[PDB]
Design an enzyme around this catalytic site. Structure first.
Site, PDB file in Angstrom:
ATOM      1  N   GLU A 102       0.535  -5.058  -6.388  1.00 45.76           N
ATOM      2  CA  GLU A 102      -0.512  -4.244  -6.429  1.00 45.76           C
ATOM      3  C   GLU A 102      -0.222  -3.216  -5.168  1.00 45.76           C
ATOM      4  O   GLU A 102      -0.354  -3.970  -3.993  1.00 45.76           O
ATOM      5  CB  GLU A 102      -1.761  -4.794  -6.524  1.00 45.76           C
ATOM      6  CG  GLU A 102      -3.069  -4.069  -6.476  1.00 45.76           C
ATOM      7  CD  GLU A 102      -4.421  -4.780  -6.228  1.00 45.76           C
ATOM      8  OE1 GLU A 102      -4.205  -6.233  -6.295  1.00 45.76           O
ATOM      9  OE2 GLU A 102      -5.388  -4.218  -5.940  1.00 45.76           O
ATOM     10  N   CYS A 111      -6.482  -7.073 -10.158  1.00 46.66           N
ATOM     11  CA  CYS A 111      -6.832  -8.483  -9.244  1.00 46.66           C
ATOM     12  C   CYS A 111      -8.116  -9.124  -9.756  1.00 46.66           C
ATOM     13  O   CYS A 111      -7.828 -10.234 -10.332  1.00 46.66           O
ATOM     14  CB  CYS A 111      -7.105  -8.082  -7.575  1.00 46.66           C
ATOM     15  SG  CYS A 111      -7.422  -9.615  -6.868  1.00 46.66           S
ATOM     16  N   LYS A 122      -8.530   1.608 -12.037  1.00 41.46           N
ATOM     17  CA  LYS A 122      -9.270   0.315 -11.975  1.00 41.46           C
ATOM     18  C   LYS A 122     -10.699   0.345 -12.325  1.00 41.46           C
ATOM     19  O   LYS A 122     -11.391   1.321 -12.072  1.00 41.46           O
ATOM     20  CB  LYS A 122      -9.068  -0.371 -10.572  1.00 41.46           C
ATOM     21  CG  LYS A 122      -9.421  -1.895 -10.412  1.00 41.46           C
ATOM     22  CD  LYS A 122      -9.124  -2.156  -9.082  1.00 41.46           C
ATOM     23  CE  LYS A 122      -9.748  -3.664  -9.044  1.00 41.46           C
ATOM     24  NZ  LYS A 122      -9.268  -4.373  -7.773  1.00 41.46           N
TER      25      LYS A 122
END
Lengths: 289, 289, 289, 289
Positions: free
Chosen positions: C42, C163, C129
């Site tokens: 990431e 995440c 995200k």
């Protein structure tokens, strides 16, 4: 012709039934000079954590942020309940309109709302904040469209916005289209920026801007009140905490919307059009028989 | 890092080939100190008719309004023609980006527009005014949506707006959505309130407000230049006419949108959405083979 | 039967054309042992700012936060542009399916995204995200519903989540409902709890959890690959940076949904029903003819 | 701060008034160390037929499955009646909360429910299992939406789910939305899967996961208890049957929902929305005057 006050007092920051009596005594002090609308600052009941960083790096999350968070969480209110009944009975004892910046909870989340009460001790509505600014995004929650209120009264149409929601150009032109002529705007900053930012709203609208900031000991705040022509009625009190009053000619609006008029004969509808989605959106929705 | 100068000139009001040489004998003095962008006031070529009432009662239309109109109509320019070639050949010799406030005719109408020129002496485009204010509605015309520019240049993006088109929130938020960082704004009013009005745009945006007004003899104009942190670099020159310069650090923008940043991440697309109808609408349209 | 490799690299953190060659000199070593799918950690291109607090108190906003922000903003990419053409030409030469964690800019905002590439060097799509976690809310932005992909490929279907978008149960059950059997999941935390968190997704679904974390010098990252029977094939490499490989028997899925099998036959449509609003919502929209 | 126990005992499998006294003696053994909430495994009273296949091919249905079925049917209870009165009087003798996994009948059908009792010997409610797993579909019944309970107490909010109903992502996010901070979860499997599966629920929620499995002689079960931070308080006892206890700080929830908060400030309501149909559905419904 009505008359309105703003306050500039601070809070005791913990033990929320100790700061709930300061409101009582100041409300009675503002009663005596024949006031009719009283405005209180942002986060007056819940308290505003100034200076605190909660020890946030970039995903450290130490143990000395969690205790701070729970000590802060344990000092908020919830609407409705036993702390809005007391404020209703507070504003019901005589004839006064009360707006109030509290911090509410709703199952381990914190909101920064503002409450509206009438002259007969009812509860009109509330307005949760659309978007917190910088480091309050870690601790507060986001509000949605189904909160922005209208609230016509026999002394005018009152509505509100909080600290930097007064910079959004598209939320103001939704406030304008519903007919606001008294624009409350509590805040939590004390700059030269702010006094020159409220004048623009008072001209672009046609409304009496009536703001309130708190003075503590560290943000020596200056609250004021502005005519719809751009003339300050009661000045930026940078010295101490005091009650600030002025009188509001409601015929000074019809004359200020002779030159300029947003939503009406400006804002060419053949080129521009805004539209607002006002739906009560929630995650989990039970339905029964 | 670039540097830009605004002027605070005045016009001769009649006999428009005479006032086109002021635009050189001020210009070379403006560009001799190593300048890179020059901004001129509103209605600098055609002349802004101040004080004149044209004897309009309610539709009486006397004989001393008609001659007063036609003498004013006779002192306009037209684009493209022999008076923009002079400005292109002007800006082509040395190197500057030239913006300019003119008054144009198009078959017995008058349109208060603003022109843009690059450093190689080409013509980028123009921006007519959306809505004239109060009594200018009698003598000027309305603009459409298919005119608002941005003109990406190798020193940044450069839009414009005229006197009270800066109060319209929808037009500002449509300027912002294309990425303005140099916000030129000619005007023709000089009050205490206009400075406070421009500081708010500089904060709400992230751009450099770079205004210009005329000073004649009654136009006590005050033109200035504001950082995107709300700091005046070169102050409101109310005394006499001059040349006003400063430097424009274009890295002081990325640092100013660390906090605020309108549309994304601070606009809420889930509740608000604006849309713009940018169509070239004209009355009679001829088609052939 | 396919086989896939995750990496456990680290970025150079500044001067982003320098960290794009690491993504070749590790990549050909990863593809020389006959690989077919490569997964990167990431924020591998832009760099994940660790430790940095930006001097945010509660809204103090000191001068050593702005420069720190702008230096980080200046080290992003933008899609589509000259930095994704390099990745397409990279994946096109030999044959691999390339997924990649980047950081993109879109007019002074930062979006933590992830990119998908096929074997013929085309660009499939991206996934921004949904919600940044705690202090990443100040520097990154929010995603809408109109981004979640699946991308049916001739080696199976391949989605992603970042995440702590793997804790949201609704997003997982919306991923499952399209038929994920290869569940790529970059991350930026390395605790003992994350392994136990990924085993549950591998059992609840029927997919291959294939995660990737970075190891630098404090990112003691441990990346792994889990069968849909809750068996770790290639273990949590906590020691140094390496290349981690295994084989992915795609017939071991049909056999694992003999027991559990979410939506149908184990979800109950008569009591529960979920719905997703996948609309491309944006603030300002221009329309022409 | 409360404290709670789980048990690990097995049943005598037939003669249900012989296993109804084991509960009495173990409940009195758990009384002495000042416990306040006691949890019992799945199918404690009715018994769980382990190993038994009932001689099912694919429609043979031999005679040596019918006798097995009637011998199994003849050892259940029914609520209410003479076997819940005894448990009410059992929990009424002192101050304890009792949750209990029984098997009830309702006219020749079998259910796998769980009974909830208070500290004063009332009967709060029950929860029939939503969907049995594999071969229990032949012998048990399906439950509907009008059973899943809330049950606020003066020591918290207790709720439950049974063996593999803790894998359904949509039933958990209905448990979460009602406010569960003590999450009971009896089961009937003993794998490494299960310990790593309960940790994820403890993190994704914010609740104390408090599970209980049985040890017999063959599923050597390991029961445990997990903090809302993911830390095991009382470990996986794989050796023998014993009482397992720990203490539950209820101020450890407010601090664990600082980072992550499902239903609240995660779970973006503008994209996702679950809704639950909670109606008492029955086949034949007499109504009278």
């Amino acid at each position: 012709i009505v008359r309105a006050t703003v306050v500039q007092a601070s809070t005791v920051f913990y033990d929320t039934p100790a700061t709930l009596d300061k409101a009582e005594r100041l409300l009675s002090e503002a009663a005596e000079n024949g006031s009719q609308l009283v405005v209180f600052p942002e986060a007056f009941i819940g308290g505003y954590p100034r200076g605190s960083t909660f020890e946030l790096a970039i995903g450290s999350r130490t143990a000395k942020g969690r205790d701070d968070f729970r000590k802060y969480h344990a000092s908020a209110i919830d609407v409705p309940g036993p702390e809005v009944e007391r404020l209703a009975l507070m504003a019901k004892k005589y004839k006064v309109y009360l707006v109030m910046g509290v911090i509410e909870r709703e199952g381990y989340t914190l909101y920064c709302t503002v409450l509206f009460f009438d002259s007969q001790g009812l509860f009109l509505g509330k307005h949760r904040k659309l978007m917190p600014t910088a480091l309050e995004r870690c601790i507060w929650g986001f509000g949605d469209g189904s909160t922005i209120p209208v609230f016509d009264t026999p002394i005018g149409k009152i509505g509100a916005a909080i600290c930097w929601e007064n910079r959004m150009p598209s939320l103001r032109t939704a406030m304008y289209a519903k007919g606001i002529e008294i624009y409350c705007a509590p805040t939590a900053d004390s700059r030269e920026t702010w006094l020159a930012s409220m004048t623009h709203i008072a001209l672009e609208g046609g409304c009496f801007v009536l703001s309130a900031n708190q003075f503590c000991r560290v943000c020596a705040g200056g609250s004021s009140i502005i005519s719809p022509l751009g003339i300050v009625l009661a000045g930026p009190n940078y010295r101490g905490e005091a009650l600030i009053t002025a009188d509001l000619d409601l015929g000074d609006i019809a004359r200020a919307k002779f030159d300029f008029d947003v939503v009406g004969h400006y804002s060419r509808p053949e080129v521009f059009s805004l539209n607002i989605r006002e739906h009560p959106r929630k995650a989990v929705s039970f339905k029964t028989s």
